[PDB]
């Protein structure tokens, strides 16, 4: 008998043990959490608006011919502003994939600009990390621009940018324009206007949302905390909750506000998690603000929301699509528990089960490769011929990569986890493709973390191994505590 | 048919793919690599000498009654100089185990001093990491001292140290004395004198060492680079190579120097990996030094050794017990490949296979626990009674911990890898309990990294899962590259 | 005799020597340099707009009762977001003046929050330095807010903020709203709109400006580099040059653009001094932009947008060395840290006009303080370590404090921009660090020939300023403790020519 | 009249006001404070020992040919480990003097390695600042080494070091050997041994020292705090106090220990100013130590080892405020950054003795420079921006450079410790930052009563030092560009008493 587990696509994955029974408040981001934007339509809209802003501000008319290609960008790429590269890197700064425009650079050539295939993430001035779902269009746009200027006759390619006559245009200054333009599209409400004038096209709607939030509110408190203003929030949330019946079968509809003990807009995250801004109440009928302490607030800070709800830190499960630094953990008061929404997980899981044959083959090749070396040790002069096998391993591995997209898996390249995966393991207690998967779990559930196995763990059997062990290895090899010395796996 | 693998205790574990065929130079640290100090005798010697230095310098006579307890210290603990705690932490700064003297502090009480069970490793002034094999005696000694002053009537326990009358003695200032004393024992040659006057007692000897080094020298170059001076190095290495026959059966003995293309002493690592010090030649018969370019050198730097050997960075496999920062990777020239000797691996592997029953039980408890929640989802009001099961999971888990020692595994506590494990995954291409395990591998071997699986990977089957998937999860879902975009898994 | 100097109010002051003959390009910021905003009318406008913004988003109506008070703020104060104090500090982080709202904290009381009367400037998270002229209304508003929440009984004062019932309202979060509101006023354009609709009220103009700029362009190139957009710049500049004559009276007026070789708008300083943004050239006839340089005839326009200081150098055919950059802002070590040559600097500090008036018109206060100081020395004369005398100086100290406070108030409630008592302010040390030349206005360059060698004055230490260049005869031998009893064969040869040249600027 | 001042060579100079009456505890460093080492004999000893050490571990025999040259090094030079230059820099990182070996790099050439003639001091990895008196022989040795490897044909000069055949030998790694060797000489005790075996040759002594210390102890407590061990301290101190009389001639000699309330050895400064090491009390009769304080009669000894400055404060029953710490070392913001009160400071700077002699005995050089400066001003008099004149100042500049170099060489090859031309050195700015009081020796305190109020002198900026306190009458109205045209109902009330007190030190 093997362990029971819910169906794969309904699962909530566990990084750190979490006893859901102790959770008293449920907190939601809105954007890409409750309001899931349809893909690739939303990225494309963001792409078009940014390109148009750039053109309206001096960039060549050629850009208007770019079309967003959803198959190219993977989230979490690092843009190197010195050399104009998109880089997929691991948790430690090692290069996995390097693309200059649409040209993927192989290993040997990479060492020219990166002699140890290494970058220092610390160099925030040089390296910009494109972690967010909103960063997707600009990730593609950056590649489009570098490709454009590289192959445009009017320009002269250099190491750190382009010559336009006697004039130099660095990748760095070009990056600033793109960054400024993306900011512009968002904060000018250009994007927001187009989204609300066509909700069906851009925003996913699902009857399960009101059901899950309903059930949460029966067991504890529910709050929203979004950077968006009330007006846009009201438009979006009305849409999400717009069904002829409430969530209980045969029940009548009710306002989205009804599902919340506390609604917070203009959150200004991430400053919100520090001292944020003064909390003010919102009169929804007039739109008049008033500092101090209806259930609609603007601004404030995470500590203030925690006070308003009568919650302590670890009583709160905060659900959202965004990875924040160690900011919460640094404070002297208890930080929140976290649930990270990662929509790509939906596609990634499909590859995991539907491309089963590719994994199979990779495993056979590995098994056969080990056979070739089976009889060899340090006294062996033999050099088995493996070039055919490797060649096939590379071909199958690349096919697998392409299953995810041109930039491969969000979580890995080959045997290496990405910086993004590493950040997920660091910040998220739980994760899933959507928060709606909580539907499939009781509120008393004990979320238990599975071990992440090191090589000597994953590849050594618990079977007792039947010559003496070298003393070079064994080194010639207080009242002890009578009760368990740690408690992180039970969450108590 | 499953994959062939060498016997567990002969294995070399792989973090990053490494084609041994391309390795042209083999580099060794001496201390705890070629010269493996017998345990716990060596730690005990270091312990006694440090305690005696402290007493000779004003600390109470009581200390002379301390005896080194090999079952207490695990390597890689963080000493918190503010509160006088030994901390086992994970890769991200989360507390796993907290010991004040010999008192292990449970969770609730920990939040008093660590409200989020979190420390900031960055705080190098506050937190000191005891990563080295030499740090073992002092790890125990620190616990001994805090325990001593806490339970000694002559003193008054405070949060950040002790009152001795109207006088305050902080943990921080006490830590400085211990650190100074350990330094003193090493650099005063006190420890070295006792070691060489009794090699059999303190230093492991193994005929396989000359064999492996012999074979390495047949295929490439071999060098030694040690911080020790030539005199101590000569004493130790003569001992290690002292057998009636050479390594080949029936062969005559030969000098240890014969096994090296290049011998470097007074290396002053880690400055050695930067610009180090001016390289000087050593006349072994006279002991006279001479800057500039026999095969014995003193000082110098890693770039200079690489030049002397005609090697490029990635041609070099550097074998040793020490984890260095990103120093090598930061340079503009190719860094070395790495093999990390981790002697504790010898004991850890024994636990893995000999305590099979404990793992079994833990797994059954997990399987049964999942049965209890099997029929429950968010509509369930049920709260299954699990306290008996958890209680048993804690008991079995603690028994497992104690198998490693009072401070548990070097690599983990529960479902969480330690900071030390994390550093191993970051720095070491390969690791083993000893470098001698290379004996069991041909020089043409392709070391291949195994994936470290995330939760959604390790707990989801490649079996195609047979209601529509929520659009909240799926989001209502350039010439592509025709060849593999990465190469780190083949090392080419 | 005595050294000839120009009239005090026409002087350019010299921190580091500058041979004007080598300057080939003159660069100008616009705001508070060419366009000098009327005071206190312009500060008061910024204040009211910022106040109104805060009220419009929830701050109490009582804020509307506050009137801008130009006598209160001095530039360069540090706002401590932890304790809600405005601090006047010296170059080394020592506290000189501490105001909590409009309450000045003196001596011993300061030690409760600042145990060594010291802050660590590096803590940019905690301390915000209000260095700019635009920061003036902000400086006053912070004080108004701390003061109001303190006096208003609706709010309960704590060390790090106020409680409004169950809600804590930290000084840090209140500061954030003030910063947001100041930005909003500036970047939504309310301030610019009010400005251009009454330029006579808000903007100074002087016929000497076209004159000086025309002379500059006879010996070199002249450029404008401003963060403002072209529309605003054009409105401002047209006004500055709007006289019924050109550079000289009786000459034809000409358009302001005719005075420049290059006009750079939307500069995005300080990013501008790094890699900035892609340079575009602007067609003002059309309003369209194009990145790079126009290929056709439009290339003969001179209006550009974005770019970087390196790019501007290239366009002008200049090396940094031969550019004098004239403006009101102090930048960091950004320029000199580069591999590229940095610009010479002239810092405009308009408060100098008022400060020099105090220095010169309040001479009797300076004279009394000197007399009192001389009298104190007299009281201790002929006393040494064997002496038991404790002369009573309490009356003299009381007068010193009284006259010194009177002097302070001549500058304003926060004292001089440049000092408090014997101590220079942080702002003053930043001036000495960043500016080669400084004056109340760049217009003082009118009074110097372009061949002028500006020579830096020595800044004297205590042992230099209080000891004469006169042979001091000693009766007894000097202590070997002081002298150190001071009076192989290889010795280096001494240098035969001067080893430094920073004072001649003569490369 | 004119202000009374003590004789220049007896003066204590004041950076920040200090009411001596409030000082209740006097603390002393030993090295270069109480034990002033003979110059240049002691520098030369350190030099030779360090040279010998380097030779003994592989450096060429030719190093033995170098003789210490006291006329070369000035304290506070920055060694650039990248390019192998000794740099004299100002407070802001600007280059004043650059020496590569014994070759001085001038003007334009400096720009090749320093494009803006600027270094970033923060780059502690690259730049090592040689601030201490012990660093003097080291400063000279670095120059000797760069010079020797440059001239010796066995080695080929590169930008960042030398090639010895196939071996590269970077300036950074060579610097590391020099640092290691200096430490070794100090910490193996070779230097201490040579010192104590000839104290008359290496250590100054003055009967005024016991005198001054005895007076201090009549008004307050006196303590010693030294990094040295008791054995060395005892040998040094016994020598310093070895006269056939006590404090006053004709009085009985007494042991040096009798002059102190507390003797702290093995202080491990600067860690000492943090948490240091556990305090132990030393029994000098026995030589044994015990952490904490002796419980029995031994508690009446006064020799301690290790500890921290906070602990020492506690032992003395003093608050930081009332301790004056006298020594030759400049510490960082360590003390004032603490929640605990920091110590007042008297900085001993023995070079001041020679510097003051130049200031006073070379008056004719100062007079010529003033004349030349006045003549330059005359040549530009009555010229303004309309003027085409380019007066020829080349002859005057040449003389200025010549006289200025002559002045420099009066101090040494690297010029004054405190300045180069019109610019203060980094060292000078650190003095102003760290020291309340300074002098060539603490012995000058002999010439002041313990009731003395030390009053800081203003450090004048250019617009203060070159403008008189005299009413300046203006014919034409001042430009609104300079004045800003400067001349709700709620206004704050002005402060009625002085808002700062750092100049009276009167809490």
PDB file of C-alpha atoms in Angstrom, chain D residues 270-455:
ATOM      1  CA  UNK D 270      40.071  48.601  19.358  1.00  0.00           C
ATOM      2  CA  UNK D 271      38.039  45.510  20.340  1.00  0.00           C
ATOM      3  CA  UNK D 272      38.369  47.080  23.800  1.00  0.00           C
ATOM      4  CA  UNK D 273      35.910  49.788  22.746  1.00  0.00           C
ATOM      5  CA  UNK D 274      33.316  47.158  21.835  1.00  0.00           C
ATOM      6  CA  UNK D 275      32.873  44.127  24.073  1.00  0.00           C
ATOM      7  CA  UNK D 276      36.609  43.461  24.326  1.00  0.00           C
ATOM      8  CA  UNK D 277      37.634  40.398  26.295  1.00  0.00           C
ATOM      9  CA  UNK D 278      36.649  39.194  29.763  1.00  0.00           C
ATOM     10  CA  UNK D 279      38.167  41.467  32.411  1.00  0.00           C
ATOM     11  CA  UNK D 280      40.696  39.755  34.633  1.00  0.00           C
ATOM     12  CA  UNK D 281      42.515  41.168  37.660  1.00  0.00           C
ATOM     13  CA  UNK D 282      46.266  40.626  37.769  1.00  0.00           C
ATOM     14  CA  UNK D 283      48.337  39.847  40.827  1.00  0.00           C
ATOM     15  CA  UNK D 284      51.689  41.362  39.872  1.00  0.00           C
ATOM     16  CA  UNK D 285      53.383  39.816  42.904  1.00  0.00           C
ATOM     17  CA  UNK D 286      52.428  36.399  41.573  1.00  0.00           C
ATOM     18  CA  UNK D 287      51.801  37.055  37.887  1.00  0.00           C
ATOM     19  CA  UNK D 288      48.608  35.022  38.068  1.00  0.00           C
ATOM     20  CA  UNK D 289      45.330  36.238  36.563  1.00  0.00           C
ATOM     21  CA  UNK D 290      41.735  35.631  37.505  1.00  0.00           C
ATOM     22  CA  UNK D 291      38.706  36.638  35.428  1.00  0.00           C
ATOM     23  CA  UNK D 292      36.475  39.120  37.197  1.00  0.00           C
ATOM     24  CA  UNK D 293      37.616  40.875  40.344  1.00  0.00           C
ATOM     25  CA  UNK D 294      39.533  39.280  43.246  1.00  0.00           C
ATOM     26  CA  UNK D 295      37.188  38.439  46.102  1.00  0.00           C
ATOM     27  CA  UNK D 296      39.724  38.716  48.924  1.00  0.00           C
ATOM     28  CA  UNK D 297      42.415  41.250  49.866  1.00  0.00           C
ATOM     29  CA  UNK D 298      43.983  41.113  46.390  1.00  0.00           C
ATOM     30  CA  UNK D 299      41.052  43.271  45.294  1.00  0.00           C
ATOM     31  CA  UNK D 300      43.045  46.291  46.507  1.00  0.00           C
ATOM     32  CA  UNK D 301      45.587  45.908  43.703  1.00  0.00           C
ATOM     33  CA  UNK D 302      44.811  48.048  40.658  1.00  0.00           C
ATOM     34  CA  UNK D 303      46.295  46.089  37.768  1.00  0.00           C
ATOM     35  CA  UNK D 304      43.766  44.522  35.361  1.00  0.00           C
ATOM     36  CA  UNK D 305      43.960  42.774  31.968  1.00  0.00           C
ATOM     37  CA  UNK D 306      41.574  42.710  29.005  1.00  0.00           C
ATOM     38  CA  UNK D 307      38.020  43.921  29.596  1.00  0.00           C
ATOM     39  CA  UNK D 308      36.222  46.770  27.800  1.00  0.00           C
ATOM     40  CA  UNK D 309      35.961  50.553  28.045  1.00  0.00           C
ATOM     41  CA  UNK D 310      32.453  50.214  29.563  1.00  0.00           C
ATOM     42  CA  UNK D 311      33.902  47.941  32.262  1.00  0.00           C
ATOM     43  CA  UNK D 312      36.710  50.362  32.966  1.00  0.00           C
ATOM     44  CA  UNK D 313      34.100  53.124  33.337  1.00  0.00           C
ATOM     45  CA  UNK D 314      32.267  50.976  35.872  1.00  0.00           C
ATOM     46  CA  UNK D 315      35.426  50.206  37.843  1.00  0.00           C
ATOM     47  CA  UNK D 316      36.152  53.937  38.056  1.00  0.00           C
ATOM     48  CA  UNK D 317      32.581  54.884  38.922  1.00  0.00           C
ATOM     49  CA  UNK D 318      32.668  57.339  36.012  1.00  0.00           C
ATOM     50  CA  UNK D 319      30.339  58.288  33.177  1.00  0.00           C
ATOM     51  CA  UNK D 320      32.035  58.531  29.760  1.00  0.00           C
ATOM     52  CA  UNK D 321      31.373  62.269  29.673  1.00  0.00           C
ATOM     53  CA  UNK D 322      33.782  62.907  32.550  1.00  0.00           C
ATOM     54  CA  UNK D 323      36.652  60.872  31.171  1.00  0.00           C
ATOM     55  CA  UNK D 324      39.302  62.529  29.051  1.00  0.00           C
ATOM     56  CA  UNK D 325      41.114  59.898  27.012  1.00  0.00           C
ATOM     57  CA  UNK D 326      44.612  60.956  26.012  1.00  0.00           C
ATOM     58  CA  UNK D 327      46.435  59.083  23.263  1.00  0.00           C
ATOM     59  CA  UNK D 328      47.968  59.060  19.806  1.00  0.00           C
ATOM     60  CA  UNK D 329      45.362  56.950  17.977  1.00  0.00           C
ATOM     61  CA  UNK D 330      42.301  57.977  15.995  1.00  0.00           C
ATOM     62  CA  UNK D 331      39.381  55.594  16.516  1.00  0.00           C
ATOM     63  CA  UNK D 332      36.253  55.467  14.363  1.00  0.00           C
ATOM     64  CA  UNK D 333      32.692  56.328  15.306  1.00  0.00           C
ATOM     65  CA  UNK D 334      32.889  53.274  17.549  1.00  0.00           C
ATOM     66  CA  UNK D 335      32.464  55.061  20.901  1.00  0.00           C
ATOM     67  CA  UNK D 336      29.771  57.580  19.970  1.00  0.00           C
ATOM     68  CA  UNK D 337      27.733  54.987  18.090  1.00  0.00           C
ATOM     69  CA  UNK D 338      26.987  53.185  21.365  1.00  0.00           C
ATOM     70  CA  UNK D 339      24.051  53.672  23.703  1.00  0.00           C
ATOM     71  CA  UNK D 340      26.736  54.305  26.325  1.00  0.00           C
ATOM     72  CA  UNK D 341      28.279  57.760  26.733  1.00  0.00           C
ATOM     73  CA  UNK D 342      31.529  58.216  24.836  1.00  0.00           C
ATOM     74  CA  UNK D 343      34.815  59.586  26.130  1.00  0.00           C
ATOM     75  CA  UNK D 344      36.217  63.060  25.569  1.00  0.00           C
ATOM     76  CA  UNK D 345      39.489  62.944  23.606  1.00  0.00           C
ATOM     77  CA  UNK D 346      42.894  64.601  23.597  1.00  0.00           C
ATOM     78  CA  UNK D 347      44.922  63.576  20.540  1.00  0.00           C
ATOM     79  CA  UNK D 348      48.689  63.607  20.775  1.00  0.00           C
ATOM     80  CA  UNK D 349      50.288  64.473  17.368  1.00  0.00           C
ATOM     81  CA  UNK D 350      54.042  64.748  17.853  1.00  0.00           C
ATOM     82  CA  UNK D 351      54.682  66.065  14.305  1.00  0.00           C
ATOM     83  CA  UNK D 352      52.986  69.267  15.498  1.00  0.00           C
ATOM     84  CA  UNK D 353      56.243  70.247  17.168  1.00  0.00           C
ATOM     85  CA  UNK D 354      58.115  70.347  13.828  1.00  0.00           C
ATOM     86  CA  UNK D 355      55.085  71.758  12.007  1.00  0.00           C
ATOM     87  CA  UNK D 356      54.751  74.712  14.386  1.00  0.00           C
ATOM     88  CA  UNK D 357      58.481  75.418  13.926  1.00  0.00           C
ATOM     89  CA  UNK D 358      57.933  75.698  10.164  1.00  0.00           C
ATOM     90  CA  UNK D 359      54.833  77.874  10.695  1.00  0.00           C
ATOM     91  CA  UNK D 360      56.833  80.273  12.864  1.00  0.00           C
ATOM     92  CA  UNK D 361      60.464  80.122  11.643  1.00  0.00           C
ATOM     93  CA  UNK D 362      59.709  80.256   7.911  1.00  0.00           C
ATOM     94  CA  UNK D 363      57.643  83.454   8.035  1.00  0.00           C
ATOM     95  CA  UNK D 364      59.417  84.990   5.036  1.00  0.00           C
ATOM     96  CA  UNK D 365      58.110  82.149   2.836  1.00  0.00           C
ATOM     97  CA  UNK D 366      54.576  82.874   4.049  1.00  0.00           C
ATOM     98  CA  UNK D 367      55.106  86.590   3.408  1.00  0.00           C
ATOM     99  CA  UNK D 368      56.324  86.094  -0.149  1.00  0.00           C
ATOM    100  CA  UNK D 369      53.359  83.842  -0.944  1.00  0.00           C
ATOM    101  CA  UNK D 370      51.023  86.476   0.420  1.00  0.00           C
ATOM    102  CA  UNK D 371      52.748  89.167  -1.653  1.00  0.00           C
ATOM    103  CA  UNK D 372      52.570  87.089  -4.820  1.00  0.00           C
ATOM    104  CA  UNK D 373      48.892  86.436  -4.178  1.00  0.00           C
ATOM    105  CA  UNK D 374      48.240  90.162  -3.699  1.00  0.00           C
ATOM    106  CA  UNK D 375      50.136  90.934  -6.898  1.00  0.00           C
ATOM    107  CA  UNK D 376      48.036  88.409  -8.875  1.00  0.00           C
ATOM    108  CA  UNK D 377      44.846  90.073  -7.656  1.00  0.00           C
ATOM    109  CA  UNK D 378      46.264  93.415  -8.730  1.00  0.00           C
ATOM    110  CA  UNK D 379      46.756  92.118 -12.284  1.00  0.00           C
ATOM    111  CA  UNK D 380      43.075  91.192 -12.590  1.00  0.00           C
ATOM    112  CA  UNK D 381      41.745  94.256 -10.788  1.00  0.00           C
ATOM    113  CA  UNK D 382      39.046  96.219 -12.678  1.00  0.00           C
ATOM    114  CA  UNK D 383      38.564  93.406 -15.185  1.00  0.00           C
ATOM    115  CA  UNK D 384      35.151  91.838 -15.654  1.00  0.00           C
ATOM    116  CA  UNK D 385      33.362  89.604 -18.126  1.00  0.00           C
ATOM    117  CA  UNK D 386      33.498  92.219 -20.891  1.00  0.00           C
ATOM    118  CA  UNK D 387      37.302  92.399 -20.624  1.00  0.00           C
ATOM    119  CA  UNK D 388      39.519  90.849 -23.263  1.00  0.00           C
ATOM    120  CA  UNK D 389      42.711  91.174 -21.228  1.00  0.00           C
ATOM    121  CA  UNK D 390      44.716  88.031 -20.588  1.00  0.00           C
ATOM    122  CA  UNK D 391      47.304  89.288 -18.101  1.00  0.00           C
ATOM    123  CA  UNK D 392      50.524  87.290 -18.107  1.00  0.00           C
ATOM    124  CA  UNK D 393      50.802  85.573 -14.743  1.00  0.00           C
ATOM    125  CA  UNK D 394      53.284  82.887 -15.792  1.00  0.00           C
ATOM    126  CA  UNK D 395      56.211  84.492 -14.014  1.00  0.00           C
ATOM    127  CA  UNK D 396      54.153  84.908 -10.823  1.00  0.00           C
ATOM    128  CA  UNK D 397      52.840  81.333 -10.965  1.00  0.00           C
ATOM    129  CA  UNK D 398      56.392  79.999 -11.412  1.00  0.00           C
ATOM    130  CA  UNK D 399      57.524  81.806  -8.262  1.00  0.00           C
ATOM    131  CA  UNK D 400      54.442  80.671  -6.317  1.00  0.00           C
ATOM    132  CA  UNK D 401      55.232  77.047  -7.241  1.00  0.00           C
ATOM    133  CA  UNK D 402      58.883  77.488  -6.330  1.00  0.00           C
ATOM    134  CA  UNK D 403      58.237  79.045  -2.915  1.00  0.00           C
ATOM    135  CA  UNK D 404      55.468  76.542  -2.187  1.00  0.00           C
ATOM    136  CA  UNK D 405      57.707  73.583  -2.980  1.00  0.00           C
ATOM    137  CA  UNK D 406      60.387  75.104  -0.690  1.00  0.00           C
ATOM    138  CA  UNK D 407      57.788  75.277   2.053  1.00  0.00           C
ATOM    139  CA  UNK D 408      56.769  71.641   1.474  1.00  0.00           C
ATOM    140  CA  UNK D 409      60.350  70.462   1.784  1.00  0.00           C
ATOM    141  CA  UNK D 410      60.555  72.199   5.161  1.00  0.00           C
ATOM    142  CA  UNK D 411      58.183  69.468   6.368  1.00  0.00           C
ATOM    143  CA  UNK D 412      59.599  66.602   4.336  1.00  0.00           C
ATOM    144  CA  UNK D 413      59.419  65.050   0.873  1.00  0.00           C
ATOM    145  CA  UNK D 414      55.689  64.347   1.289  1.00  0.00           C
ATOM    146  CA  UNK D 415      54.868  67.779   2.707  1.00  0.00           C
ATOM    147  CA  UNK D 416      52.823  68.687   5.778  1.00  0.00           C
ATOM    148  CA  UNK D 417      50.875  66.126   7.753  1.00  0.00           C
ATOM    149  CA  UNK D 418      47.908  68.514   7.670  1.00  0.00           C
ATOM    150  CA  UNK D 419      47.756  69.912   4.177  1.00  0.00           C
ATOM    151  CA  UNK D 420      49.018  70.244   0.650  1.00  0.00           C
ATOM    152  CA  UNK D 421      48.606  73.713  -0.770  1.00  0.00           C
ATOM    153  CA  UNK D 422      45.145  75.085  -0.037  1.00  0.00           C
ATOM    154  CA  UNK D 423      43.875  71.560   0.750  1.00  0.00           C
ATOM    155  CA  UNK D 424      43.613  69.765   4.087  1.00  0.00           C
ATOM    156  CA  UNK D 425      44.691  66.136   4.124  1.00  0.00           C
ATOM    157  CA  UNK D 426      42.499  63.177   4.991  1.00  0.00           C
ATOM    158  CA  UNK D 427      44.527  62.893   8.199  1.00  0.00           C
ATOM    159  CA  UNK D 428      43.681  66.488   9.123  1.00  0.00           C
ATOM    160  CA  UNK D 429      39.965  65.846   8.592  1.00  0.00           C
ATOM    161  CA  UNK D 430      40.146  62.786  10.830  1.00  0.00           C
ATOM    162  CA  UNK D 431      41.777  64.887  13.561  1.00  0.00           C
ATOM    163  CA  UNK D 432      38.916  67.413  13.334  1.00  0.00           C
ATOM    164  CA  UNK D 433      36.435  64.552  13.479  1.00  0.00           C
ATOM    165  CA  UNK D 434      37.887  62.556  16.383  1.00  0.00           C
ATOM    166  CA  UNK D 435      39.805  64.916  18.714  1.00  0.00           C
ATOM    167  CA  UNK D 436      38.247  67.444  21.088  1.00  0.00           C
ATOM    168  CA  UNK D 437      41.761  68.747  21.885  1.00  0.00           C
ATOM    169  CA  UNK D 438      45.150  68.241  20.239  1.00  0.00           C
ATOM    170  CA  UNK D 439      48.828  69.070  20.743  1.00  0.00           C
ATOM    171  CA  UNK D 440      52.325  67.728  20.067  1.00  0.00           C
ATOM    172  CA  UNK D 441      52.135  66.220  23.533  1.00  0.00           C
ATOM    173  CA  UNK D 442      49.636  65.900  26.370  1.00  0.00           C
ATOM    174  CA  UNK D 443      52.288  67.595  28.525  1.00  0.00           C
ATOM    175  CA  UNK D 444      50.958  70.986  27.344  1.00  0.00           C
ATOM    176  CA  UNK D 445      48.051  70.440  29.768  1.00  0.00           C
ATOM    177  CA  UNK D 446      50.666  71.466  32.353  1.00  0.00           C
ATOM    178  CA  UNK D 447      50.112  75.054  31.216  1.00  0.00           C
ATOM    179  CA  UNK D 448      46.368  75.210  31.838  1.00  0.00           C
ATOM    180  CA  UNK D 449      44.322  75.246  35.058  1.00  0.00           C
ATOM    181  CA  UNK D 450      41.811  72.399  35.544  1.00  0.00           C
ATOM    182  CA  UNK D 451      39.011  74.954  35.566  1.00  0.00           C
ATOM    183  CA  UNK D 452      39.943  76.005  32.004  1.00  0.00           C
ATOM    184  CA  UNK D 453      37.183  76.223  29.447  1.00  0.00           C
ATOM    185  CA  UNK D 454      38.661  75.132  26.133  1.00  0.00           C
ATOM    186  CA  UNK D 455      36.727  77.056  23.458  1.00  0.00           C
TER     187      UNK D 455
END
